[PDB]
Symmetry: C4
Subunit: 355 residues, 4 copies
């Protein structure tokens, strides 16, 4: 609610082309298709092939920024990006070679930031996952067997075995309800009463395990990435040691592209930012274009009012952001700093129209 994320966060065309590229699979897969567009899209694979392949050798030129890097991951597919289709072209002379369109599916995961963020925490908590997972396996065959107890007589063809009941186990326990083979008798129907009650407690915990400290990591991700952009501010020599830990939980940084709007005039004032790199378009009669290491909105927070400038991104600005309360926290945290935001709440009233 307090951040301006822009400048094509879904930027690189590498990540893009799997989306169109894989949809070209389908028409090959389907009878009653004229051969015209059958192969027209086979090129389009050869395009993205050629295109990543065009990208490829430039990537293998890893002499750019070659100081200290661990690029086993980013290359791990680029290799197979182009070979697996290729040998597929020959040894699978039949059209099925296209079925190696499962292969690009890591290309998003090549440049998927937020995926290593996933895998990072699985390696702390999987202790639980297993003890749950086993326990999921506990409750499975604990219960799956209890049907084999019963309907083997009148439902051999459906419940004449164990795994056929393990089939009906997780279909039942995992909230689903397919609806192919269901009991008939009383007691076998009784047993269901704890099942949903159970499984929704199980995943009641287990999927809960995921978000549990995942959010910590993401709520940590916004710190670790933002103990940066701290000392840049010329004013933060006087902030206290413990003061920051409160703050930076909320402060998210994002970039804005050139030309974009930052805050429009006349809209109600709700938030202030800290500029740390770039330049702005403070639309006043004399544009107060503030450079790296600036801020604005105290005019809008201390008074509780609409905006004093249609501020727009003159350049690609790496922005911070902060709503009122946690700025009221700051002005409450120290009378030292509210002095200059009191002064600046008078200076920028005339510095805006003047130079």
């Amino acid at each position: 609610m307090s951040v301006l994320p822009f400048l094509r966060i879904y930027a690189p065309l590498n990540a893009v082309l799997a989306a169109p590229g894989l949809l070209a699979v389908a028409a090959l897969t389907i009878p009653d298709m004229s051969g015209r567009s059958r192969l027209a899209l086979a090129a389009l694979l050869a395009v993205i092939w050629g295109a990543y392949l065009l990208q490829l050798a430039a990537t293998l030129l890893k002499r750019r920024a070659g100081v200290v890097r661990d690029r086993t991951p980013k290359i791990a597919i680029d290799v197979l990006a182009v070979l697996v289709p290729l040998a597929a072209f020959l040894l699978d002379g039949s059209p099925d070679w296209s079925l190696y369109c499962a292969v690009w599916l890591l290309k998003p995961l090549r440049d998927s930031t937020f995926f290593p963020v996933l895998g990072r925490v699985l390696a702390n908590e999987a202790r639980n996952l297993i003890g749950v997972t086993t326990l999921f396996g506990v409750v499975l065959f604990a219960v799956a067997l209890a049907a084999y107890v019963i309907e083997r007589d009148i439902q051999p063809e459906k419940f004449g075995s164990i795994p056929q009941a393990m089939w009906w186990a997780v279909v039942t326990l995992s909230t689903t309800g397919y609806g192919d083979t269901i009991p008939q008798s009383f007691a076998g129907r009784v047993l269901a009463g704890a099942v949903m009650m159970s499984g929704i407690g199980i995943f009641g915990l287990w999927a809960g395990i995921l978000a549990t400290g995942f959010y910590q990591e993401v709520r940590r991700g916004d710190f670790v990435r933002n103990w940066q952009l701290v000392a840049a501010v010329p004013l933060f020599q006087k902030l206290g040691p413990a003061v920051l830990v409160e703050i930076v939980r909320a402060l998210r940084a994002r970039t804005v592209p050139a030309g974009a709007v930052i805050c429009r005039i006349g809209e109600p004032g709700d938030r202030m930012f800290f500029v740390v790199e770039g330049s702005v378009s403070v639309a006043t009669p004399n544009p107060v274009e503030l450079g790296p290491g600036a801020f604005f909105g105290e005019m809008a927070l201390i008074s509780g009012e609409p905006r004093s400038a249609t501020v727009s991104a003159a350049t690609t600005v790496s922005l911070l952001s902060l709503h009122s309360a946690d700025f009221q926290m700051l002005c409450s945290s120290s009378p030292e700093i509210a002095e200059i935001f009191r002064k600046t709440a008078l200076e920028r009233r005339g510095a805006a129209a003047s130079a």
Copy 2:
């Protein structure tokens, strides 16, 4: 648990009439219907048409309160509120013109406060949503394909393609279980074992993303709306800077209409309020009708007892509210203020029966 929300929070008849209005759709949609009430309700559209249309021009008189306003949203439908049915009346000479009863469906969302509260936070966290959404797309075709591997031989008509398996993908992954086309073999049935385990982890995270900082916003909404109603209290010059940030998390403000009851006598005392605007009905032999900037319940909290007055809303009062602990926090937070709540715990014992 600590708030008195009243005075028709679902107030305006603009938001209302879509509810009855759209149900008039149905009878047109149905064979074997006499033409009598077929058209009787077509008027009822023409009513709400005429009614919003009656409202309309008065809304286009935006010379009321015309100081600084951004009403592109609120008008955005009022325009189409009345035209879209109208041109529909002619060009769609057939009865299908009523099918533009999808159009009013934003009229609730016209005056739906709490909906911009939704959209505010989507523009901070959608970075995640996409990386999840892609990742949802990752796992989809990662898995959907694995059925095309198998049942193309004996289930052409069901699993003779890719998208037919992508159909069975999200039906399966999204907790559902339609129950039309299900595998037969072993290994194809094996693959399900991670699916529900997966998707309930996925939405285990993803829908979790929604409530995650949404609650922050709503838990923030109760601050931002309530850094107001602070300085009104004549006693809050001595409260500390950091003191407030703790408090206002809990303090919710709501309005009560005239005539309503606020706290009934004899019921156990559990909460105290801060009056800031309006007047009350403190039912005593001499009603101590306290105006803006008042409170009551310390008689009920410091002793731990039932109520001393059937306090009722003599007028439309904008109320605050506060349970004990966080008032015990306050009396614990400072011996300065408990003095006057000690005194007031004696004054109001006799001021209640006296004047």
Copy 3:
């Protein structure tokens, strides 16, 4: 994890008999039943009828503890507990009179503490619920209509109307998958892709609303019920104002019945309690039976060891409880109090075997 709840929390036989009582419904409901046990259980209604009716008049003697009470709730069913069956006996001369066995179903909710705890918070947050509920209604007909767009031609009999699609709406959106009427075409099948994605976000929020501050109330319930049992401890005159608010979040109180076990000897020491009312069975050669306002386990916490006594409930003790950390919080919170728990960690070593 830190509480000993015992003494028949599901105590009163009033709440009990609905459970057996209502199961007597069934056999009446079923063809091919001999008349023998048909009516044998009709008495059993007449029993619980007579039994609550026996209870009844004693309840109408509300001259016990008649100081200040609001018993409109508790009586609200006892009235209808016995009349509704009665007039049902005559006017419904046919056996269907038993179908007023929906009536006792509030009798649990008569003495269901934890149910008013539910209703308390619905009256704060229903502002959201409605704006969601409407929004649920928004998305419903927003989408339900989109099927009427399509399959009216080849599925008149299933999708030849609006509500038949609203039927398939919430079946689909609410995670279910009945599996009666499903589309056939492409685009109508496309639309599902956001649905589960949506509804699991919707209830992703909405059911989240319930637990959201519900837990606050229950986490508050353990305070409000436990600002009691504070001043009873003779040692809590020196605890700081803010000190308590941290603590009492964790401290839950429960009662134990006479004869029961409290902590068994030899088991690892993990928790200590504060006795405030009753007496114990500290099994030592000289039983140190401590009365109201006592504690034990510092021998087990300061050393990090197993138990020094098979302490058992000599009487009905209202207990508190506290694990280590939050007691380590206390010994960390003040060197003042650890002195006497240092001394008591020597006194009780010999006071246990001595008198």
Copy 4:
């Protein structure tokens, strides 16, 4: 995200063999199976029988570490581990004796740490569970009956009774959708509208109850297990009383086996550890193998850089771990301690290459 869990957390072969052992069930359960491998796996039971039985008597030698122990749990199955199959071998002369392969299913739960962690908290909160559980039973028959109201006429064979509707109750309320017997009329179909809305609120709370303080316990489990490994550090005499309670929430301890890698050189520096027992492989020209009571990474945190050593586990090290922020918390928490981490940030620069 901040822990290195290794050394076969799924270690003991006791817990293992149920997994293979129980899968041998299946082939016995299936017609059209040659008798060859029918019995080959019956030995494999006799193996694990013999194997646990081999383990058994060594376990009954509970003269190892026999100081104070409560091993009623761990033995509780080892008894039945071997008898229940045995008497099953004779009295169940028919092959069904194998159906006592439900019996080992506690053997994982024998050595399942994290399962007593489950049961610990159920004995605090089941007060709620019941009041919910009853309330689940409230809403069940509250609603299940409402179908018997209706479809008894035209659906005797499906809805000609109560429990047949209670069948359709929880199938419906518990998010499932089997899809066998569904209404036809209007009003009976209306009633569903609150059901999913309800049940997802119910489990909206109820399964929420599980994770609610479960996470407290697990977030407590990482304290209680880690008030240990505190005084071992020679430097923690000066840390404040309240200082620790913040810290140890985050500090998780895990063990690493000999030979494993701890932090690889060149990777970006993100975390530091506290060694408390064992030895390391700090790969430098002169390996600075630090023993119990050591740490490393301040070189990587104070500068914000990659790693200075491919530190690898020379021995089985019981490790702690700590990311930056909470170490920035520490260096912020006291200028006293940052002095020696300033000095050590110079000493280890040359102590690494020197001895």
